[PDB]
Design a protein around this ligand. Structure first.
Ligand SMILES: CC(=O)Nc1ccc2cn[nH]c2c1
Ligand SMILES: CC(=O)Nc1ccc2cn[nH]c2c1
Ligand SMILES: [Zn+2]
Ligand SMILES: [Zn+2]
Ligand SMILES: [Zn+2]
Length: 459
């Protein structure tokens, strides 16, 4: 059951307004033929243009919502909309382009998909709410065949050029005019009652319906993300490394240890309440503090209400000592908190647009994160950058320029001059810090936090 069988049935009720008289009995095999494509009994890596819900989830980075609305179809101009916000008008002679023939439209399609996807995925998955015109328009910009490799590199081919008769990946397709071996999934096959807008609107208020094709394309991808990552969650699906995943995760571990260790030294809390990851390990193993864990899986729909996490009868007194919320998204943090909250607004190669203001953060696993809300942090302040170290000033073992910084909290800086070891360690920590912030993470701390209290931990 690796791929979707072409002999699987396709429900055609959603297609009968654009395609009147369409047979109720229909397979993927007959549908692909009707779309103007011939598979020719080919056992060459592309068994079906359509993929399963499971194959779509594994390739969520390739998702591009796609919708076609008739402006007037052979004789009528078509508005092609994409979840990138692009609308192209194809004549058969929220960006909006005037009517142009297919030979030029197809060039823009390849450019747009290559620019959006080259740093996300090795393919494209057209996410549909199929009504007919999107399927019958595919023959105008899509070519299919055996699985091929790029002419300039080892990646799989996603584009084709009729000018040079060659194939390219998303990185080497400039001047290419055809989308080659794309994938697609019709969301309507999943079993829904009512139209696209009524299902999308049940879960999302951030996307509206301006009655343009890109609005429907955006709503379609959003509904698919809601079904696959919000109501249904799967943390056993691994996703390939496409960027700074390892560095970001290593930086997050360094920053957490640094910030918690300093908070414990500066304010000497007798107890720490560690809320979140059921598999968490103490991030400051040598700390004196009474470490107490509370299990909460990552919330993928709405942020946790602090009243439900803490109340309904544990030290019971979460007001004692400090609360650590490391990527545990709550509606309103208590004043005695140390917090790391992912900022969904920072779109990235890792961070894909999500449902209802939220975002799909994909780093090893897929994590749909509720929309960032500045009001969650009203009892706290932004944590300032600082580097703290109690390790001995000793080199052991890249060159040197003397470091001068008021935020290098070390015995050597207290004593007047930062040693080479702490200067190297400071610069590496600052790099890790900037990496985490730029990846989208935001750090918040209790208002009384003051690094001035760390200088006296050198006595
Ligand atoms: C920064 C940015 O625009 N990201 C992005 C990534 C993937 C898709 C799919 N549809 N719209 C998208 C947008
Ligand atoms: C150098 C150092 O002490 N680092 C550190 C950082 C995080 C964790 C978590 N568990 N043990 C840790 C140790
Ligand atoms: Zn290439
Ligand atoms: Zn939406
Ligand atoms: Zn030093």
């Amino acid at each position: 059951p690796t791929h979707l069988s072409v002999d699987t049935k396709f429900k055609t009720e959603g297609l009968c307004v654009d395609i009147p008289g369409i047979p109720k009995d229909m397979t993927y095999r007959r549908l692909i033929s009707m779309m103007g494509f011939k598979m020719n009994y080919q056992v060459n890596g592309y068994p079906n243009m359509f993929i399963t819900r499971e194959e779509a989830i594994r390739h969520v980075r390739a998702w591009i919502g796609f919708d076609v609305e008739g402006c007037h179809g052979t004789n009528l101009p078509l508005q092609l909309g994409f979840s990138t916000g692009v609308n192209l008008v194809a004549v058969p002679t929220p960006l909006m382009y005037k009517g142009l023939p297919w030979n030029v439209v197809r060039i823009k399609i390849v450019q747009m998909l290559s620019d959006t996807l080259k740093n996300l995925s090795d393919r494209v998955v057209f996410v549909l709410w199929a009504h007919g015109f999107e399927l019958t328009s595919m023959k105008y910009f899509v070519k299919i065949g055996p699985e091929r490799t790029c002419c300039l590199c080892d990646r799989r081919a996603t584009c084709f050029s009729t000018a040079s008769d060659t194939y390219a990946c998303w990185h080497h397709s400039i001047g290419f005019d055809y989308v080659y071996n794309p994938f697609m999934i019709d969301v309507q096959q999943w079993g829904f009652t009512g139209n696209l807008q009524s299902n999308h609107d049940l879960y999302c208020q951030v996307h509206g319906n301006a009655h343009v094709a890109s609005c429907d394309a955006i709503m379609t991808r959003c509904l698919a993300v809601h079904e696959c990552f919000v109501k249904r969650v799967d943390w056993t699906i691994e996703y390939p490394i496409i960027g700074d995943e390892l560095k970001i995760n290593a930086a997050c571990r360094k920053v957490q240890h640094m910030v918690v260790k300093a908070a414990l030294l500066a304010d000497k809390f007798p107890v720490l309440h560690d809320i979140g990851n059921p598999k968490a390990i103490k991030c400051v193993p040598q700390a004196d503090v009474e470490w107490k864990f509370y299990d909460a899986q990552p919330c993928s729909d709405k942020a946790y209400k602090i009243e439900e996490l803490f109340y309904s009868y544990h030290s019971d007194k979460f007001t004692d000592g400090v609360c650590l919320f490391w990527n545990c998204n709550v509606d309103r943090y208590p004043a005695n908190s140390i917090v790391c909250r992912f900022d969904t607004r920072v779109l990235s190669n890792l961070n894909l647009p999500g449902c209802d203001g939220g975002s799909l953060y994909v780093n090893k696993h897929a994590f749909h994160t509720p929309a960032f809300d500045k009001s969650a942090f009203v009892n706290l302040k932004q944590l300032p950058f600082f580097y703290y170290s109690d390790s001995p000033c000793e080199s052991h073992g890249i060159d040197y320029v003397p470091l001068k910084s008021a935020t290098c909290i070390t015995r050597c800086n207290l004593g007047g001059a930062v040693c080479r070891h702490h200067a190297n360690e400071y610069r590496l920590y600052l790099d890790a810090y900037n990496m985490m912030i730029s990846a989208g993470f935001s750090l918040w701390v209790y208002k009384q936090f003051d690094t001035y209290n760390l200088w006296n931990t050198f006595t």
